[PDB]
Amino acid sequence: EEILEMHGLRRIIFDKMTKAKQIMPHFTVMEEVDVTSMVSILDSAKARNRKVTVTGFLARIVPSILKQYPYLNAIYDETRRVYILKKYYNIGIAVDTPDGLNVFVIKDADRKSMVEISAEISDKASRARENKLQLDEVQDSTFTITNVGTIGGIMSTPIINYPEVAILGVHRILEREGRKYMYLSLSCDHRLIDGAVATRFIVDLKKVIEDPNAIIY
Amino acid sequence: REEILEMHGLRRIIFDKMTKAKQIMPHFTVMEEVDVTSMVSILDSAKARNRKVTVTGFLARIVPSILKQYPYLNAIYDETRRVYILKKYYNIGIAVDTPDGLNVFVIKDADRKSMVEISAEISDKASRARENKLQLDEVQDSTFTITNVGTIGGIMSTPIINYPEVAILGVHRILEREGRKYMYLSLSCDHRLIDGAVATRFIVDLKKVIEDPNAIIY
Amino acid sequence: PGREEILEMHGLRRIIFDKMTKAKQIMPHFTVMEEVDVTSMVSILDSAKARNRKVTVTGFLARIVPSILKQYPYLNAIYDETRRVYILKKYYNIGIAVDTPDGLNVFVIKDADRKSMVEISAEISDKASRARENKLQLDEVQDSTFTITNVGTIGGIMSTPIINYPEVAILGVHRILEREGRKYMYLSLSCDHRLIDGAVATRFIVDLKKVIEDPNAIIY
User: Fold this and answer.
1) CATH number of C31-217
2) Which cofactor does it need (chain B) (predicted)?
3) CB distance A100–C32 less than 8 Å?
4) Is A212 on the interface with C (CB under 8 A)?
5) CATH 3.30.559.10 fits B27-216, yes or no
């Protein structure tokens, strides 16, 4: 039988994942989303230009709804008692590497359009796998998105990249009937993200991916 | 540019008691799918003359029934480790949203109460709950808890049992398929008292009823 | 009104209390799930319920899973109590979850990679039927490198299972469905989200979908 000891990166996640579920009791909701109009919005932007990914695109909406449900992007402090809510909506997106997991953070989302968000993610990925991500480039996420939905899955119950308060679960696009669906999932600090507040968000995010001719306004 | 926001009356009460919730009770939570077709037209008819009732208050009536079949799930955790205390009355925690936070109220002795007596209650217990007029009377010895979010959204959640009880039951949005109307159900519980198996055997033995309410007359 | 009743604790009950308390105490849990075209499997079972009793879903599954624990070695491990340790295991000894009157028991198909479909399915009843009668021996309940829990012999679409501590991964079997015009079923995974990352976890079950997905090829 072969062993090892906890190495560099694998060390960071060991201690941050223990912390994560050590401290924050998790609650998770899932919602079906008609990503049909979605798809053809991506299959149109792939032709007439370049880029956008399912991931990137979902990162363009996510802030604007964090804006609306304020409690969803805070972090939890040293101090039991307090919270620091956040008003600079910028996201992290977890990538697989060789050495381990990662979460580069694309700064103030709600100001880089969709194309950009999605080249940002690649520059930060194709480097993530080289692990040449300057330590600047991994801080200050108000909130995080995780997509297995490239590698597979249909539904996940993620662990909240601490010390954020929420994270979002992206997945494989599945073909039931004749319209393309994808389940999303949200896990969040149920010390503060209550019954409704939880859902009420995912349902709203749902509500947009499910009518993007709107996003325009 | 940030915002402090500590906590208040309730927030702080929920904080500690969610901390305390999922700190001791390890969580198995399972989901079955229910052909709630035959339940919906039950209700949708009672609108056309019977005044009520509600998806919840309906589940609430059957729920106790099925508890008496598997005692372990209507059981409260305790003080010292080493102690179990299952109860044999039935008061069901059913928890609405407020602007203040998550409130939870218990329909005392639901096993004696009527589909309507239940539902015509949850209403006057929750119109209050948001406008914050709810007596201590209305909030103590719960035996188990049900939590409808599908009046809002979602297909399935991973809800967290209300302490110190031992199981909980999530309800979520109702969707068409064939189109018969299904919706997913979920119940989470303590994996010390409720071995995985027997919880499943609870929701199916619930699932079954929701799919044969004719046969609720037993 | 009302009247409660204080119900104490026991050998096996209290050992479940423990394994469980201490399961989620330190295994911070992740869950993921895919859906399988179990339609091409399920029918295989059906040709062989006719001529060669028996073979199950649990049987079928048990005998594929290790060959997929081979590809990703990271989930076939114990979790160590000099804290920071590995014990990535390299032999496969698959666990099983089963309801016995007294409480949840587990047992192990010693060396799964060496046993054919039937033999394991023989062994499972020859142990469940004996855990039920509470006559199951100390060397049979040990050494599990990984465990499967089936509930869809009673129900469930999908559940978040709890690892048999101190293993490191668990796979959760469910009922089949009949979507249209196909027979699907949800599988589930739960693993220590440290010694097992984000992707990997799914990347795993997906390759396990893959070889339920086309059994026709699993002659070799």
Assistant:
1) 3.30.559.10
2) (R)-lipoate
3) no
4) no
5) yes
Find the length of chain C: 220
A171 is catalytic: no
Token pair, residue C190, equals 């739960």
Resolution (A): 4.0
Q: Are strands B156-157 and A174-176 parallel, antiparallel or unpaired?
A: unpaired
**What distance in Å separates the CA atoms of residue C202 and residue C210, rounded to the nearest whole number?**
12
Burial B69-83 (b: 16+ CB within 10 A, else e): ebebbbbbbeeeeee
Q: Radius of gyration (Cα) for chain C, nearest Å?
A: 18
Q: Is the dihedral of CA C28, C90, C122, C117 positive or negative?
A: positive
According to CATH, the topology of domain A29-209 is Chloramphenicol Acetyltransferase (3.30.559)
Burial code (b: 16+ CB inside 10 Å, e: under 16) for C149-165 equals: bbbbbbbbbbbbbbbbb
Distance CA A105, CA A117 (A): 11
| DSSP H helical ranges for chain C | 11-26, 39-50, 57-71, 117-132, 199-213
Q: Side chain identity at C166, as an amino acid letter?
A: P
Amino acid letter at C102? D
CA nearest C185: which of C40, C13, C22? C40
Listed residue (C175, C212, C213, C173) closest to C190, CA to CA: C173
Query: What DSSP line would sit under A136-196, residue for residue?
Result: GGS---SEEEEE-TTT--SEEE----TTBSEEEEE---EEETTEEEEEEEEEEETTTS-HH
Contact C198 A148 (CB under 8 A): yes
If contacts are CB pairs under 8 Å, which of residues 174-203 in chain C contact chain B?
Answer: 177
Q: Which of A188, A192, A193 to mutate to test the interface with B (most CBs of B within 10 A)?
A: A192
- Most distant CA pair in chain C: distance in Å? 66
